[PDB]
Each structure stands twice: as C-alpha cells, then as structure tokens.
Coordinates of C-alpha atoms in Angstrom, one line a residue:
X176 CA 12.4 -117.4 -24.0
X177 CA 8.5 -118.0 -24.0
X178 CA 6.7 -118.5 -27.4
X179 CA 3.8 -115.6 -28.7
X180 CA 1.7 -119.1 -27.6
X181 CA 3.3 -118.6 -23.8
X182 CA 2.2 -115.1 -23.9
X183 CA -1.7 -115.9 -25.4
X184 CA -1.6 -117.9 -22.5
X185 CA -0.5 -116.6 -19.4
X186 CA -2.4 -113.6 -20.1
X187 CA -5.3 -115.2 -21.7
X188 CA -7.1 -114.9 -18.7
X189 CA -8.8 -111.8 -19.6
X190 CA -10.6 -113.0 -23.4
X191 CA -14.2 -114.4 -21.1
X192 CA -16.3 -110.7 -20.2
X193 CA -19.2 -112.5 -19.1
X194 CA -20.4 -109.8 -16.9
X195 CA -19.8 -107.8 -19.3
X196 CA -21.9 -110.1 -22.4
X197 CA -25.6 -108.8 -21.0
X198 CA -24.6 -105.0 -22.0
X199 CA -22.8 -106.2 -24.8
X200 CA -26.5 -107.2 -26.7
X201 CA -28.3 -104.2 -26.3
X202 CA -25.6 -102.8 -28.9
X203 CA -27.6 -105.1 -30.9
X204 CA -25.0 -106.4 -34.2
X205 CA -23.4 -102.9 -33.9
X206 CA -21.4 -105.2 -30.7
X207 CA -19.5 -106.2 -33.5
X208 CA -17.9 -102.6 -33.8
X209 CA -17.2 -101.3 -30.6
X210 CA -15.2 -104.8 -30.1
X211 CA -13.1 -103.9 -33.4
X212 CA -13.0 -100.0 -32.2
X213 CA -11.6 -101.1 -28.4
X214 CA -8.9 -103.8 -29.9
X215 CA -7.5 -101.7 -32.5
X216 CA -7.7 -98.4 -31.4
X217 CA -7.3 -99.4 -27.7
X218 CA -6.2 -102.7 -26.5
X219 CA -3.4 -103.1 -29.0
X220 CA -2.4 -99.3 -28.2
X221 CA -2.5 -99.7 -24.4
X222 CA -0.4 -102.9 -25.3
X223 CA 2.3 -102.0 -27.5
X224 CA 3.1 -98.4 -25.4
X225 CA 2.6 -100.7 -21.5
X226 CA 5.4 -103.1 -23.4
X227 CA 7.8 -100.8 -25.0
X228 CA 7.9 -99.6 -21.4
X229 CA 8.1 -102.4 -19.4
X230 CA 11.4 -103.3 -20.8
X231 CA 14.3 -101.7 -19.4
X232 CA 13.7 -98.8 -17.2
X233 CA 12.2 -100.7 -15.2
X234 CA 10.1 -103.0 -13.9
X235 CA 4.2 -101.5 -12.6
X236 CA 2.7 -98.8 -13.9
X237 CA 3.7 -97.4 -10.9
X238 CA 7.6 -97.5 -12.2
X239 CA 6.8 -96.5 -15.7
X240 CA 4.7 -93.5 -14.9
X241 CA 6.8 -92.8 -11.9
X242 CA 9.8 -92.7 -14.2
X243 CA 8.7 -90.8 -17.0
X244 CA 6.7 -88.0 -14.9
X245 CA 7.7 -88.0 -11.4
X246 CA 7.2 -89.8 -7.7
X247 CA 3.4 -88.1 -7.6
X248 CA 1.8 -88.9 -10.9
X249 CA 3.1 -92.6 -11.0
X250 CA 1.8 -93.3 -7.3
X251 CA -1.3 -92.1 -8.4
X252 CA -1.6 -93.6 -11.5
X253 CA -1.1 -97.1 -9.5
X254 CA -3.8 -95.9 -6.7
X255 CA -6.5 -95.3 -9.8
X256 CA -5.0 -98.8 -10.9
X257 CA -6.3 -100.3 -7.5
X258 CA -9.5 -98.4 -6.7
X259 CA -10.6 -99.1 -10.4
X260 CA -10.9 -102.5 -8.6
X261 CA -12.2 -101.4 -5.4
X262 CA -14.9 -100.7 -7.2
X263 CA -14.7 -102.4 -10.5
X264 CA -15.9 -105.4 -7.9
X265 CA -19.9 -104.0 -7.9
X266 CA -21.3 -105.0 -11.8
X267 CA -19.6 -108.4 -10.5
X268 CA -21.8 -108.3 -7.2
X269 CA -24.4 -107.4 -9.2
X270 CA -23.9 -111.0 -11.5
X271 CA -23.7 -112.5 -8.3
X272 CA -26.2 -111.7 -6.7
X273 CA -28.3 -112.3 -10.4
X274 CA -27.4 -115.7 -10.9
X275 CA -28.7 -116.3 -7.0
X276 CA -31.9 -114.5 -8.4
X277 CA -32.0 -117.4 -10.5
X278 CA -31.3 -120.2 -7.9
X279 CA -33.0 -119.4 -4.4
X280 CA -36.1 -118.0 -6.3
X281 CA -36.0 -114.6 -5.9
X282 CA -36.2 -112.0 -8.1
X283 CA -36.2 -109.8 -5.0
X284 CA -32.2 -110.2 -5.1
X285 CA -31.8 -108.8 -8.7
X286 CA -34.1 -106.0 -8.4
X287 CA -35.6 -104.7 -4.7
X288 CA -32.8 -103.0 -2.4
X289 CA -32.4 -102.9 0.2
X290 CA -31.8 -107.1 -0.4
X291 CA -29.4 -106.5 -3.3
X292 CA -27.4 -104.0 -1.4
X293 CA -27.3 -106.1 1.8
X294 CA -27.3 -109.7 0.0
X295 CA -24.2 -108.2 -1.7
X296 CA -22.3 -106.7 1.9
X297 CA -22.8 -110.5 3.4
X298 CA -21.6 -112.1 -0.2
X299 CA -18.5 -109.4 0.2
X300 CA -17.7 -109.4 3.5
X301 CA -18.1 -113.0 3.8
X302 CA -15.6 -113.8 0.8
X303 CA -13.2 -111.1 3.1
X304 CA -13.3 -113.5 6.3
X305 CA -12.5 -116.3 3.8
X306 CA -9.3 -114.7 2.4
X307 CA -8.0 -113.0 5.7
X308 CA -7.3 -116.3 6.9
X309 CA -4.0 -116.8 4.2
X310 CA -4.3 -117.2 0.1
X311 CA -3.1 -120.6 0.9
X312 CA -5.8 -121.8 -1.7
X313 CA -7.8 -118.6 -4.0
X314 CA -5.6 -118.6 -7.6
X315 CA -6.7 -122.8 -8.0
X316 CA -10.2 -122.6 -6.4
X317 CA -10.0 -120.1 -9.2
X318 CA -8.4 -121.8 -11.6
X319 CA -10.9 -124.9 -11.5
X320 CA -13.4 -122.6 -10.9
X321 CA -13.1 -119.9 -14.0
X322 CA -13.0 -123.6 -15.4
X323 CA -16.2 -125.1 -14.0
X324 CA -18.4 -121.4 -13.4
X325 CA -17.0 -120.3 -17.1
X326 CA -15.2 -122.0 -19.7
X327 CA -18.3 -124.7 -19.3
X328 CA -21.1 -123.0 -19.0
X329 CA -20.3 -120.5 -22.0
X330 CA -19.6 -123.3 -24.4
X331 CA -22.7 -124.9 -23.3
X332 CA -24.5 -121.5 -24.0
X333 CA -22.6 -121.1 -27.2
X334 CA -23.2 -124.4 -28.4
X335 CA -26.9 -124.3 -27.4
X336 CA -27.8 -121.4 -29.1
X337 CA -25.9 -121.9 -31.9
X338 CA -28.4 -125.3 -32.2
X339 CA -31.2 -122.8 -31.6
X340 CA -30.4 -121.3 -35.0
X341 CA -32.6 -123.3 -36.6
X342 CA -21.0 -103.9 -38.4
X343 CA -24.0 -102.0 -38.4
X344 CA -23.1 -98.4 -37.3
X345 CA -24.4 -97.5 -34.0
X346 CA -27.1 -95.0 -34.3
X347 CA -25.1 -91.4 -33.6
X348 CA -28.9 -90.5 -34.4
X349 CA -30.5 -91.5 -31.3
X350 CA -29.2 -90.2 -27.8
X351 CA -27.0 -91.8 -25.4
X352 CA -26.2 -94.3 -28.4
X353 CA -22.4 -94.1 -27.1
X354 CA -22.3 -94.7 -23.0
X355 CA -22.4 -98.8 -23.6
X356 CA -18.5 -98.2 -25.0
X357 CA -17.7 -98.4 -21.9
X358 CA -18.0 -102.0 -21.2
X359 CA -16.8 -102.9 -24.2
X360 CA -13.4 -100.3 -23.1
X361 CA -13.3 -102.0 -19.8
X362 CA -13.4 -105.3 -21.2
X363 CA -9.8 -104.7 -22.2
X364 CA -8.7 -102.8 -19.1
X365 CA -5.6 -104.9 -17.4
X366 CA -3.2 -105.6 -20.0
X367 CA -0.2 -103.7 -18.6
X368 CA 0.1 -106.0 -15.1
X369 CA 1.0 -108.9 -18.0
X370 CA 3.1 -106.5 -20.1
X371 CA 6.4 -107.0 -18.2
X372 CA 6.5 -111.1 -18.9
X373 CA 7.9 -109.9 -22.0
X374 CA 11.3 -110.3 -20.7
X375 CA 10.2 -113.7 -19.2
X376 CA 9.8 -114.1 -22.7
X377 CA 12.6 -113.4 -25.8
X378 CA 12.5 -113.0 -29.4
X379 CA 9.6 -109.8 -28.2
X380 CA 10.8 -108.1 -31.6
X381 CA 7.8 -108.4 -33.9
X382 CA 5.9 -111.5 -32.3
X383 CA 4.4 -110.2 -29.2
X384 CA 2.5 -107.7 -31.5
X385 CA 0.9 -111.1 -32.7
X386 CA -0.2 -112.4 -29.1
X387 CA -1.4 -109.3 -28.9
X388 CA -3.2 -109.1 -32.7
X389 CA -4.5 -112.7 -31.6
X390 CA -5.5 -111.6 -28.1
X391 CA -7.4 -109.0 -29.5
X392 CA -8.8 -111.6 -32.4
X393 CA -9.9 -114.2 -29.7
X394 CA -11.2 -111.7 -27.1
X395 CA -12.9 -110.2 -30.2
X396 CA -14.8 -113.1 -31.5
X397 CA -15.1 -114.4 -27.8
X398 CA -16.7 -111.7 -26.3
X399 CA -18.9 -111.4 -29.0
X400 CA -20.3 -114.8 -29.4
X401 CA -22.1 -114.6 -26.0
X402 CA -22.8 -111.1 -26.7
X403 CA -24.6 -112.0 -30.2
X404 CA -26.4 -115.2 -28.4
X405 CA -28.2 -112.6 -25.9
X406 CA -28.5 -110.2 -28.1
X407 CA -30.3 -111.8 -30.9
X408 CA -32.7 -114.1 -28.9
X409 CA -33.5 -111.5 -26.3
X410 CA -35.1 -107.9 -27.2
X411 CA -32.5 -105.7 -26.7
X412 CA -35.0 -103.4 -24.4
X413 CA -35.5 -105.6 -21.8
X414 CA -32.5 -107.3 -21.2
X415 CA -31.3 -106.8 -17.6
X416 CA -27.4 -106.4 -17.0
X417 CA -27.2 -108.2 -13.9
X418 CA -29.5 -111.5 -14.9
X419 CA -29.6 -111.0 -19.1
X420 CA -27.0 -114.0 -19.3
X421 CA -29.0 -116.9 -16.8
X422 CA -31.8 -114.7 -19.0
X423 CA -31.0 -115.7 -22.3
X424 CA -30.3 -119.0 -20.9
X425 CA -33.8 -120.0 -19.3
X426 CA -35.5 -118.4 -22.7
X427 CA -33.0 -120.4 -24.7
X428 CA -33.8 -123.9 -22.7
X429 CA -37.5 -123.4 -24.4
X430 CA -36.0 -125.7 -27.4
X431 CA -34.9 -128.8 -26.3
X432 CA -36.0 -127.9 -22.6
X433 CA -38.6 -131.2 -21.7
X434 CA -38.6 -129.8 -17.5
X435 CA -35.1 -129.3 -18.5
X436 CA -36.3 -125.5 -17.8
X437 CA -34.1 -126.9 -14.9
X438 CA -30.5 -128.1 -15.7
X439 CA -30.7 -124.0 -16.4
X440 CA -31.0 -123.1 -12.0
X441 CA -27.6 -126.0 -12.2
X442 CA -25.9 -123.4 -15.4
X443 CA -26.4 -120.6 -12.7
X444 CA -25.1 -122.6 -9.7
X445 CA -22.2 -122.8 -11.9
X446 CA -22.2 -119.2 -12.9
X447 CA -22.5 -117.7 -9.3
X448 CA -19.5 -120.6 -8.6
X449 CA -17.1 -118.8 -10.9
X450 CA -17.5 -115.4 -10.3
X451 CA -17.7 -116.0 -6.9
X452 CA -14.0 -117.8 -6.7
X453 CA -12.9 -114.7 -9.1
X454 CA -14.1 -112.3 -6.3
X455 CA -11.9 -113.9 -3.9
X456 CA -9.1 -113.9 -5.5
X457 CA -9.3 -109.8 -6.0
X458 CA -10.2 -109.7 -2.2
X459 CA -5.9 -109.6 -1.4
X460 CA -4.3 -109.9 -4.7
X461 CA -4.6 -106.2 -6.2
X462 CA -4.3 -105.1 -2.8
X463 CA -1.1 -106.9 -2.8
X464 CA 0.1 -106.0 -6.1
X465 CA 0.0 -102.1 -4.4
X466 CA 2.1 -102.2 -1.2
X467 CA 5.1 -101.4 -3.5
X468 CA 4.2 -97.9 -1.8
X469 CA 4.4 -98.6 1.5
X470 CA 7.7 -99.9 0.7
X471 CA 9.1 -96.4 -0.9
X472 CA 9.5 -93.9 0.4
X473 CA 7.4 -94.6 3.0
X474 CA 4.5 -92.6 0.4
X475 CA 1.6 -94.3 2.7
X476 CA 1.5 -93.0 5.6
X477 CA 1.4 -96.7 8.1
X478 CA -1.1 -97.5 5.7
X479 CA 1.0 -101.5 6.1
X480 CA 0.7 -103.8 8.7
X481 CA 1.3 -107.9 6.6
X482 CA 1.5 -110.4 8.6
X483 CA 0.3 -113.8 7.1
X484 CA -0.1 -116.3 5.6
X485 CA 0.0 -113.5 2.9
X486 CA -0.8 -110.2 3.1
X487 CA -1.3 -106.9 3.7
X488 CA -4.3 -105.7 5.6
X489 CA -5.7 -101.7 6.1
X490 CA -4.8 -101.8 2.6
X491 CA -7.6 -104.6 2.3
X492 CA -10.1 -103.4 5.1
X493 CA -10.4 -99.8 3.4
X494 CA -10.7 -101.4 -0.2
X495 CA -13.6 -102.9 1.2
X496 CA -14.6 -99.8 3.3
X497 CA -14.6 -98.2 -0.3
X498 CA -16.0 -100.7 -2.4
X499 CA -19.0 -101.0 0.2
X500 CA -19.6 -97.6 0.4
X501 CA -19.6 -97.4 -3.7
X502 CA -22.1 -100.1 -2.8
X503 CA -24.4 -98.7 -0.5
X504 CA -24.7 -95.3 -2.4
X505 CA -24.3 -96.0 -5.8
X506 CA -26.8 -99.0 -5.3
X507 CA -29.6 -97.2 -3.8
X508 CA -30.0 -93.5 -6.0
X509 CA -31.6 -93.7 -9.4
X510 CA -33.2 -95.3 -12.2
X511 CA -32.5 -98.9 -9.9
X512 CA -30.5 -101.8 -10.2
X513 CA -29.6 -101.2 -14.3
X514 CA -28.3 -98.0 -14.0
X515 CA -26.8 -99.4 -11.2
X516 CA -25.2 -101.9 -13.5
X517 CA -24.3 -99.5 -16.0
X518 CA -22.8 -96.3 -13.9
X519 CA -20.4 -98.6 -11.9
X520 CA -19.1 -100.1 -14.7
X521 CA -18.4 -96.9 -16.1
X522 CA -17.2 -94.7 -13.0
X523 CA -14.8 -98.0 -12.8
X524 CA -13.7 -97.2 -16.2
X525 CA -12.4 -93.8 -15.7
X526 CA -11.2 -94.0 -12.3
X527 CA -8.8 -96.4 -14.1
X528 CA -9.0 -94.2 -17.7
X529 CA -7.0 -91.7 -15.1
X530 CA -4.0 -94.3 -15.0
X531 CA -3.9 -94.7 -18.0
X532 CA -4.1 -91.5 -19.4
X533 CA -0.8 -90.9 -17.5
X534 CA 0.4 -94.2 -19.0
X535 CA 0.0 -92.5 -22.2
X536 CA 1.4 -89.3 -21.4
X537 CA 4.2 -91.0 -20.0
X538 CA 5.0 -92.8 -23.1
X539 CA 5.2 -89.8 -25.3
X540 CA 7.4 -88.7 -22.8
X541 CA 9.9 -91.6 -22.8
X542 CA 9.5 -91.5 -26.6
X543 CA 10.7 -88.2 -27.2
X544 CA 12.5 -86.7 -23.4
X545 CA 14.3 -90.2 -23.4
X546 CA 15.3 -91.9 -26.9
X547 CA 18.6 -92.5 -25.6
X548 CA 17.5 -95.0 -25.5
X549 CA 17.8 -98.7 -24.0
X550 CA 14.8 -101.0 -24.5
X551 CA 14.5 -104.8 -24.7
X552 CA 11.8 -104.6 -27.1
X553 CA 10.5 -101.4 -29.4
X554 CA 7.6 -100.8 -31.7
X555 CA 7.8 -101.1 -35.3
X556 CA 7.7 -97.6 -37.4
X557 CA 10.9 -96.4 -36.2
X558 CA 9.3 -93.5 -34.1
X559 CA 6.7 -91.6 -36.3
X560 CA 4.7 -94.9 -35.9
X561 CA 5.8 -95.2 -31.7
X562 CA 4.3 -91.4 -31.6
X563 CA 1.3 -91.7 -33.4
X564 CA 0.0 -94.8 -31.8
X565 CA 0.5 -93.6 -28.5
X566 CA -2.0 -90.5 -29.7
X567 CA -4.5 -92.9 -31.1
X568 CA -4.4 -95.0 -27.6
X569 CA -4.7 -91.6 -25.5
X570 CA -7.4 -90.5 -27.5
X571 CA -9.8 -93.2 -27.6
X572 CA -9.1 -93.3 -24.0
X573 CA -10.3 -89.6 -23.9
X574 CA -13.4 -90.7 -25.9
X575 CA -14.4 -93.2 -22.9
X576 CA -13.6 -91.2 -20.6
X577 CA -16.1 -88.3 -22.0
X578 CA -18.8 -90.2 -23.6
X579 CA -19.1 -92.2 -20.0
X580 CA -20.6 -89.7 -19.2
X581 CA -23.6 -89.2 -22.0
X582 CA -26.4 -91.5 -20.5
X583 CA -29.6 -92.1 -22.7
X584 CA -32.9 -90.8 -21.2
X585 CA -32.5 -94.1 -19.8
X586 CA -30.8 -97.4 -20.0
X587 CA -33.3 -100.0 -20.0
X588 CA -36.0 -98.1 -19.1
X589 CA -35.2 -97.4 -15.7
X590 CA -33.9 -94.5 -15.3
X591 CA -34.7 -91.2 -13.6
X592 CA -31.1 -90.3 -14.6
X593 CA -29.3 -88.5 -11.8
X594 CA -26.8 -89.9 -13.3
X595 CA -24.0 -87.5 -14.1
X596 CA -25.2 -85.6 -11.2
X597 CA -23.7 -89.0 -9.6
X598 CA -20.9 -90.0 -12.0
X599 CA -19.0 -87.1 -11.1
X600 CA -19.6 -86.7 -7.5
X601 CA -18.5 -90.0 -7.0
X602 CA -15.2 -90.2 -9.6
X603 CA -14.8 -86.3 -8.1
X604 CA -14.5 -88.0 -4.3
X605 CA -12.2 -90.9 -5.7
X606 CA -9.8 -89.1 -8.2
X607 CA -9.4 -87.0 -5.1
X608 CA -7.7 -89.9 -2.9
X609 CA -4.6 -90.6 -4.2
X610 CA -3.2 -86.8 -4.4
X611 CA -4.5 -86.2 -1.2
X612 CA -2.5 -88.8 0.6
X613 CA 1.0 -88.5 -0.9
X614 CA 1.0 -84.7 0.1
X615 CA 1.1 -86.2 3.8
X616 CA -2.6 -118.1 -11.2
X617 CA -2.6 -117.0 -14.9
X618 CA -6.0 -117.9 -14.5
X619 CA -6.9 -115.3 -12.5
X620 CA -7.3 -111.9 -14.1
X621 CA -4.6 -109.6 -15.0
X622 CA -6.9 -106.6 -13.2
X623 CA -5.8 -108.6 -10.4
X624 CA -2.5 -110.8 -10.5
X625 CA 0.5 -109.3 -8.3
X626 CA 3.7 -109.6 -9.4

C-alpha cells in the first residue's frame, strides 16, 4: 500500500513546465484550454490505459507494447521513448543557454549562432564528462536543485506578479492557430515510466484515477499560473521562448524594482541552476532506463559495454551524437532561434507521439484479443468505457501528431518557415532508427527516471 497522496507525489515531478511557460503565453487566456484539452482528453487517457497495463502482464512500455503486438513494435515503441529525449534535451538547451543571456550579458547567446549552437555543445558535453564519471550524486543535486532553480524562483514569480495586479476559444480563424498544442501535449508526455508504482501501491481500484484527476488539476492550474503571468504582462508577439520567462521577470521587477532590476540576473542564476542539474540527470538515466534491450535477446547489436559506477555507455555517446547533431542542424536553418524553440519541441513530440500511438493500439488490443483477463487494477465502465477512452487518448494523440505540423507564417515573427520541409526530414531520419536496427529521485522527471 501507498496512499493516492504517495502516488501525487512520487510522480509529481512532472506538474513545473517552465520551459515550456514562455510558449504557453502567446496562447494568450486561450492557455487556459489547451491545458483542459491535454488533461482530459490526453493525460488522464495516456494514464488510465499505461495503468490498466502495467498491472499484471507485466512489468516498460517496452513490455506492454512488446506483449500486446510483438518483439518489433514494443522495441521500437521504447527506442521513440528514448530518442524523444535525445532530443527532447534542445528547447531545454535553449532555456539554458537563455537564462545565461541574462547573466554574462549577452544577448549574443539567445539569439546569434553560431554562439548558441556552440555555447550549447560545451554546456552538453561538459554536463556528459560530469556524469561519465558515476551518478554517485545527479538525482539530489537534482533534488535540491529542482528545489532551489524551480520550486523558488516560480513562487517568487508567482507571488510577484500576482502583487503586480494592482477559456477564450483559440482563433481556428487565423492560420497556424493550432501548432502551440504541442507544448502544452508534451507537457504531459512521461506518465507511463510512473504508471507501474501502482502495484507499489494497493487499494488502485477507483483512487489512482484521483492522483491522476488531481495531477492533472495541479499540473493544470500550475502550469498555467506562470503561463498567465507572462502572458498577460508581456505582448504575446514578442515574447521569446528561450528567454520570455527571465523576460517577464526583468519587465515585472519595474514595480518594486529600486536597482533591484538586479536580484532578477540572481532569479536567472537560479533558473540556469535548476535546469542545468535536470540536464544531468537525463545525461545516463533514460539511457539507463533502455538497456533492457541489450539484455533480450540480444536486439542491440553490442550496442552495451556498463561498467561503472553506473552505467551504460555507446548507449550514452550516441544519444549525445544524436542530440548534437539535432543541435547543429536543427539550430542553424530557418526563421532562427524561435522556430528553433518551437520545431524541436514539437519533432520531440511526435518522435515520442510514435510510442505512444502503439501504447494505444496496444491497449485496444489487450482489451479486446486478451480480456481473459488478470489485472491488478481495471478502468471503471466495465469495458464500453476501457474502449472508448483508449479511442479518445489515440486520437488526440493523432491530432498532435498532425497539427505539429501546421506552422503559422511564422511564430514570433521569425520565420522563413522551412519548416515542414524540416519537421519531416528530420522525424523521417529518426522514426527510421529503431526498425532499422532490430532487423540486424522522484524529483527528477518521469521522462527520465529508470526503473
């Protein structure tokens, strides 16, 4: 037994999107929405299917997708699962190296290349020769530093702006209205890793459905206060993804701000502190949380050589040699560094989307190929209900994975939009990877834990 409290908890991780909270704003109070549209019709989808799952095959992805569809599509379905990281590291990158713009003076980080793109290979390579050495110390750094760089500085943004006081539809009228969904969709992304601490945890019946309506609640009104505080004290035209947080910060000081225009570089210190002990601990955890291939079957081919004090190793090298080629191409073609922003977070997203599509899939399939029948915990309605969830979850996934790929004529005026041109290429390249090679602490986030 652990309480729907435990479970809030050990996940919980995952309710801060701070990288995420400058896109957020330039939804403007339709932010509101997409939140609600991503929780209900997503999260708590993705959630209830991962769980039902989880719980008595069993015990990843990788063995629920494996199960219910074969050796090839769960493999992959874990390999989309881990590059979605290889890659889903660049909008943080980006934060970094923005909240540096705001330190060392220099806007020359957040906007001119080649800097950003190098400043970001030393920052990324550089957190790499810290971990090779053993994870010895990553999940606490981490722990007191989503406290310091995170859980602080937010509530002293949200407190600050709420002093500075004294679901409107998007617009399906105007073009390109749709593509932000995406961060607010990859905002969620992660849940199944925590799914299977549902056996950790007993009385899952209908409870866990409530860490999860919470979850979602929190997460909801969470990730919307710092998108709201941005987003209504900052034109949303201007606002840039990387910075746009430290942004809104420095604008907000002006009120109460007597040369105190300065404890705001200290609010990005902390900032660049967080994310960057976050970064290190997905330099070998994810990374980790895939050798279960190596393993069986022997499916990678040598792709294993742990040693210590962890940890694997190719695995990590080759993560990196993907993430810093998404780097070094995806940073430098384009409207710039905010299309930058934008297209990695979503190429992220439906590298993942992939995985969980097959999650999906895969749940239909254990529904109705295999009611016979097991489970340690079930969805409500019987079975009509199990069913037409697992439709709604697929489908909005569908959604994201299309409309990430309807760009504006250009997101915050950028923008030259060879975008899908890109996009695809790219997501083309990856989705490739996985097929081709089979043929031959609870502070950290769930993206990125190990089990």
């Amino acid at each position: 037994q652990l309480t729907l409290l435990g479970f809030f908890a050990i996940t919980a991780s995952m309710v801060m999107a701070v990288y995420e909270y400058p896109t957020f704003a330039t939804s403007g109070f339709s932010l509101v929405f997409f939140l609600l549209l991503g929780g209900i019709l997503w999260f708590i989808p993705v959630g209830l299917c991962a769980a039902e799952m989880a719980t008595v095959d069993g015990w990843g992805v990788f063995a629920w997708v494996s199960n219910t569809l074969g050796p090839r599509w769960g493999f992959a379905a874990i390999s989309f699962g881990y590059l979605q990281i290889a890659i889903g590291f660049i909008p943080m990158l980006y934060f970094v190296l923005g909240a540096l713009s705001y330190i060392l003076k220099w806007p020359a980080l957040n906007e001119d290349p080649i800097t950003k793109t190098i400043a970001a290979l030393i920052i990324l390579w550089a957190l790499a020769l810290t971990q090779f050495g053993g994870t010895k110390y990553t999940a606490r750094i981490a722990k007191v530093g989503f406290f310091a760089g995170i859980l602080l500085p937010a509530f002293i943004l949200i407190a600050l702006a709420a002093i500075y006081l004294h679901t409107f539809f998007p617009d399906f009228s105007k073009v390109g209205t749709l593509v932000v969904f995406v961060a607010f969709i990859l905002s969620y992304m992660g849940v199944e890793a925590s799914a299977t601490h549902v056996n950790e945890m007993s009385n899952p019946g209908r409870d866990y459905p409530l860490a999860m309506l919470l979850l979602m609640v929190a997460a909801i009104c969470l990730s919307s206060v710092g998108g709201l505080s941005i987003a209504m004290v900052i034109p949303g035209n201007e606002i840039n993804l990387s910075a746009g947080v430290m942004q809104t910060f420095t604008v907000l000081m002006s009120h109460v701000a007597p040369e105190i225009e300065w404890t705001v570089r200290v609010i990005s210190a902390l900032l660049l502190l967080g994310v960057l002990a976050e970064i290190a601990s997905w330099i070998v955890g994810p990374s980790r949380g895939m050798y279960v291939t190596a393993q069986k079957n022997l499916l990678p081919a040598a792709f294993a050589k742990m040693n210590k004090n962890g940890v694997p190793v190719t695995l990590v090298i080759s993560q990196l040699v993907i993430t810093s080629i998404a780097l070094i191409i995806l940073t430098n073609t384009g409207g710039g560094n905010n299309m930058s922003f934008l297209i990695a977070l979503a190429l992220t997203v439906v590298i993942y989307l992939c995985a969980y599509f097959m999650l999906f899939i895969g749940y239909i399939v254990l529904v109705l190929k295999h009611p016979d029948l097991k489970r340690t915990f079930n969805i409500p309605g019987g079975k009509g209900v199990k069913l037409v969830v697992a439709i709604v979850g697929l489908l909005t996934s569908i959604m994201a994975f299309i409309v990430s790929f309807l760009p504006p004529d250009n997101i915050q005026g950028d923008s030259t939009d060879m975008y899908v041109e890109l996009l695809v290429v790219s997501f083309l390249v990856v989705l490739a990877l996985p097929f081709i090679l089979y043929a031959v602490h609870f502070f950290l986030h769930p993206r990125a834990r190990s089990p």
